[PDB]
Design a protein around this ligand. Structure first.
Ligand SMILES: Nc1ncnc2c1ncn2[C@H]1C[C@H](O)[C@@H](COP(=O)(O)OP(=O)(O)OP(=O)(O)O)O1
Ligand SMILES: [Ca+2]
Ligand SMILES: [Ca+2]
Ligand SMILES: [Ca+2]
Ligand SMILES: [Ca+2]
Ligand SMILES: [Ca+2]
Length: 903
DNA sequence: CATTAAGCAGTCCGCG
DNA sequence: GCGGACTGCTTAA
């Protein structure tokens, strides 16, 4: 097999590399790497090395990495560019692996771990590590085993061995319900003292050294706790055995009233699953406890136990260990679904970077571009200092706030990457400039054609049409990958709906799910077999379809994120290829494209409808247009349609057969106008929206820019079994909105869009009547808590103190002196509740860590003093008032002359 | 070592 | 009791 790296580090003049050899064996080597850098040289000097602008360079081979670094400094002092890859480990990987890396994940040791630490005096701080580590569960991906290290004797209590037999039993039978499928994979190791536990764990670690180290919150808790605990007991050099190169770096962060740290373990790639989830999941959660996320991702219930965690080991050691194990497993379950470790490996090896560098789009792209240029013997430019400078982005149309009955939307494929490719935007493809006209002059096709020779953006930039650019070349590769995966995702989505339709008529039989690949649209023969399946088999197939969709989503959305990341990197001062000419060439072109096509669509629809000057495009944001289809439906007459699906089919056909060709013609004209390299402005129909035929539903509404709701029947070619609400920007979509309020507002919208005003009024009446009965957590608002210290004046709110920070301060005073109340952590999220006048907390609100029950001591007082009136008005009524006024509806029956009668 | 546009909640201040 | 300037937070893209 071809060799591939596992980890790489620079330590002084040495590169330390862990890798898999040609026999599939894990190896380590230390290399005194001899890096090269480059300097511009005279034309008369024959060379094979050229910078990206074709200027000749001479190669400077250094005896060591420090010499190369020192030379960079001297060149800066002289005032001359020092070219080439200055991150030497990237150059080393590029030199060592001068081919496309084919890696074998089965050879890569992925470790998932979590530790338990009993602490009778508040949160056990990793930087202090003053309490015994009393449990470790460490899952090894190569062994496929959960290694459980259990401390039986501690200053905080002596306990009996954990029982695997009780652990397997149902919770309803006194057990812990450790999943049956991992019972046989547990290797249990009890210890009589902590020193022996930790010594054995370190020995184990040497035998099975993680390459990828993950788990929930490992970077901020488990890793620094284990490191510091071992340091305190055995000394720092023993602790450094956690690094296969025995080198660590301690990063101390000061927070005025916190002081925590992160430990870099050289030779290990730490990918904290919380960080992976935050980067790759495209959610924004009100809480990041493993309980909350596991519930969200897997629909599994919270791991329940009685009493505080500080007392769980002593009272119920059995459950304590079981919950440690299950916690480790739940991360594995989330990854089985989301596949973020797979993604990280794919991306890391594609770029030839340290795997943990997938968190940095700048590092990732720098490496991809360096490798691409190196293949052509080209030399990359030196990174330079740039002052931060704001620049213009996308265009967003101001919508007329209103209900909108029939809507069809259209969207440009992968806009910013497509602009890059169409225009040919790259650092080395810049051909010059032209004199800009006002943007509206381009939009309206009245400005002089910018160039008949070069490819242009309305920001004034010109690019070569007959040269390949490294940015377009490499962005195209990732786009094409993205496209493949999105295809699989959409196919799985369509397949899911086929199964959902068949679930309306399940067969009474004993059968099995069909062996199919959900990444491809089901054949007619598969569809025939599906219509004969049992509910059990259909539901299993739907689970598999949805899981395929999720896998596809992870793969496509994050490749989309990477390529969009390149467009944005051009506007980040730390990017080697920072250039606002290129960054704004993209965004300005996008503004033109959107407004150009708005014009073209208005012109076209007026033409086919026999009218003039009517506004069909009601809204647009960045690369999308929303077209009012009322006149289209009216042109034929609503009476002509047999059911909802009939008009949906009609509009689908209309968009594909009539509008899309007109849109394509419009964009081809724009491409000729800008004299672009390749036409890539592909705008396809996205949503078809409207009320159910015959209903009093309003179909859709806009309240303003980035704020709308649509009742959707078909999305990007997926014909839904049941209409789906597309709500953007409204409070239902915000993690700050109380959970039950999101729910109630969504039903309010559903009723508006599908059923009408009277249905809405009936629901509002009910929710207002029952509001006071909802669980307090379900009606609490949520906020991130930043700069708490800034507004903290002796436990009281300083000037301009934000509402949620005021709540936190109220909480801190309420829990003062109590050494077992959960402290609010800077930067993390809190639940927030308003408090009635004259409450014992002495302020208008309280806040506490999100995803948690408020501590028992003050829970009673919170519940008693909760301001339900304020809460309802602010979180529910006020947003709903916004939706209904825009939609020209009332959520409450208004008074009228009819009130004089008895109905 | 490392994208912009834009809406809403809230504080402060002004307001016989 | 609101509106304008301003900060903070969180979306859409
Ligand atoms: N998360 C983001 N970060 C940076 N730029 C973004 C982001 N989302 C969107 N943009 C910019 C770049 C996109 O090309 C443009 C249009 O957004 P959008 O339509 O969501 O995706 P897209 O056009 O890139 O892909 P798709 O093919 O899925 O439509 O807005
Ligand atoms: Ca725990
Ligand atoms: Ca798009
Ligand atoms: Ca059937
Ligand atoms: Ca879009
Ligand atoms: Ca599309």
């Amino acid at each position: 097999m071809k060799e591939f790296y596992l980890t790489v580090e620079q330590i002084g003049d040495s590169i330390f590399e862990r890798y898999i050899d040609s026999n599939g064996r894990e190896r380590t080597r230390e290399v005194e790497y001899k890096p090269s850098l480059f300097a511009h040289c005279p034309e008369s000097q024959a060379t094979k090395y050229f910078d990206i602008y074709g200027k000749p360079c001479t190669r400077k081979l250094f005896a060591n990495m420090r010499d190369a670094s020192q030379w960079i400094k001297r060149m800066e002092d002289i005032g001359l560019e020092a070219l080439g890859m200055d991150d030497f480990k990237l150059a080393y990987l590029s030199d060592t692996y001068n081919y496309e890396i084919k890696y074998d994940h089965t050879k890569i040791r992925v470790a998932n771990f979590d530790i338990e630490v009993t602490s009778p005096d508040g949160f056990p701080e990793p930087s202090q590590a003053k309490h015994p580590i009393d449990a470790i569960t460490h899952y090894d991906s190569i062994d496929d085993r959960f290694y459980v290290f259990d401390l039986l004797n501690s200053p905080y209590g002596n306990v009996e061995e954990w029982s695997i037999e009780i652990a397997a039993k149902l919770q309803e039978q006194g057990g812990d319900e450790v999943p049956s499928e991992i019972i046989d994979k547990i290797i249990y190791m009890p210890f009589d003292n902590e020193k022996e536990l930790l010594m054995e764990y370190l020995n184990f670690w040497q035998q099975k050294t993680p390459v990828i180290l993950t788990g929930w919150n490992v970077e901020s808790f488990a890793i620094p706790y284990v490191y510091n605990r071992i340091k305190n007991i055995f000394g720092e050099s023993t602790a450094k055995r956690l690094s296969p190169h025995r080198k660590t770096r301690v990063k101390v962060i000061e927070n005025m009233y916190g002081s925590r740290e992160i430990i870099t373990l050289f030779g290990i790639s730490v990918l904290d699953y919380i960080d992976l989830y935050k980067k790759f999941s495209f959610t924004n959660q009100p809480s990041y406890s493993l309980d909350y996320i596991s519930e969200f991702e897997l629909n599994v219930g919270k791991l329940k136990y009685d009493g505080p965690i500080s007392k769980l080991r002593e009272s119920n050691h059995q459950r304590y260990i079981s919950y440690n194990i299950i916690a480790v497993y739940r991360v594995l379950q989330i990854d089985a679904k989301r596949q973020f470790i797979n993604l990280s490996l794919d991306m890391g090896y594609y770029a030839k970077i340290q795997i943990q560098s997938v968190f940095s789009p700048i590092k990732t792209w720098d490496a991809i571009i360096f490798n691409s240029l190196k293949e052509q013997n080209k030399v990359i430019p030196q990174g330079r200092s740039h002052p931060v400078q704001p620049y213009p982005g996308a265009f967003v149309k101001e919508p007329i706030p209103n209900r909108y009955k029939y809507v069809m939307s259209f969207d440009l494929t992968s806009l910013y990457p497509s602009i890059i490719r169409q225009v040919n935007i790259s650092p080395e493809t810049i051909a010059g400039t032209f004199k800009v006209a006002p943007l509206h002059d381009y939009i309206n096709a009245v400005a002089e054609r910018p160039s008949d020779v070069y490819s242009c953006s309305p920001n004034g930039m010109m690019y070569y049409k007959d040269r390949d650019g490294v940015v377009p070349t490499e962005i195209t590769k990732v786009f094409n990958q993205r496209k493949e995966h999105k295809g699989y995702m959409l196919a799985a989505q369509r397949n899911g709906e086929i199964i959902k339709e068949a679930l309306h008529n399940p067969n009474l039989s004993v059968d099995e799910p069909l062996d199919v690949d959900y990444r491809f649209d089901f054949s007619d023969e598969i569809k025939e077999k599906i219509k004969k399946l049992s509910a059990k088999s259909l539901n299993e197939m739907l689970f598999r379809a949805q899981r395929t969709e999720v896998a596809g989503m992870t793969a496509q959305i994050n490749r989309k994120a990477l390529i969009n990341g390149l467009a944005g990197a051009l506007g980040n001062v730390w990017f080697r290829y920072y250039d606002l000419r290129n960054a704004t060439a993209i965004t300005t072109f996008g503004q033109m494209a959107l407004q150009w096509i708005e014009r073209k669509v208005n012109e076209y629809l007026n033409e086919v409808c026999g009218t003039e000057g009517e506004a069909f495009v009601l809204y647009g944001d960045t690369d999308s247009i929303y077209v009012s289809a009322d006149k289209i439906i009216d042109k034929v007459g609503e009476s002509k349609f047999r059911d909802t699906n009939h008009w949906v089919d009609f509009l689908d056909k209309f968009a594909r057969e009539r509008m899309e060709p007109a849109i394509d013609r419009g964009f081809r004209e724009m491409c000729e106008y800008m004299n672009n390299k390749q036409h890539l402005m592909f705008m396809d129909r996205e949503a078809i929206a409207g009320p159910p035929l015959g209903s009093k539903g309003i179909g859709g509404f806009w309240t303003g820019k980035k704020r709308y709701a649509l009742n959707v029947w078909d999305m990007e070619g997926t014909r839904y079994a049941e209409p789906k609400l597309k709500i953007m920007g409204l409070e239902t979509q915000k993690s700050s909105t109380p959970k039950a309020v999101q729910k109630a507002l969504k039903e309010c919208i559903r009723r508006m869009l599908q059923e009408g005003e009277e249905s809405l009024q009936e629901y509002f009446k009910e929710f207002e009547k029952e509001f006071r009965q909802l669980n307090y957590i379900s009606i609490a608002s949520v906020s991130s808590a930043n700069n708490i210290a800034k507004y903290d004046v002796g436990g009281f709110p300083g000037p301009k103190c934000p509402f949620h920070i005021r709540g936190i301060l109220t909480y801190n005073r309420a829990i003062k002196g109590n050494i077992d109340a959960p402290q609010v952590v800077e930067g993390e999220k809190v639940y927030v509740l308003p408090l009635r006048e004259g409450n014992p907390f002495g302020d208008k609100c309280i806040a506490w860590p999100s995803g948690t029950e408020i501590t028992d001591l003050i829970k009673d007082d919170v519940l008693h003093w909760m301001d339900y009136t304020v809460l309802l008005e602010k979180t529910f009524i006020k947003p709903l008032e916004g939706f209904t006024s825009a939609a020209k509806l009332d959520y409450e029956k208004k008074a009228s002359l009819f009130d004089m009668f008895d109905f």
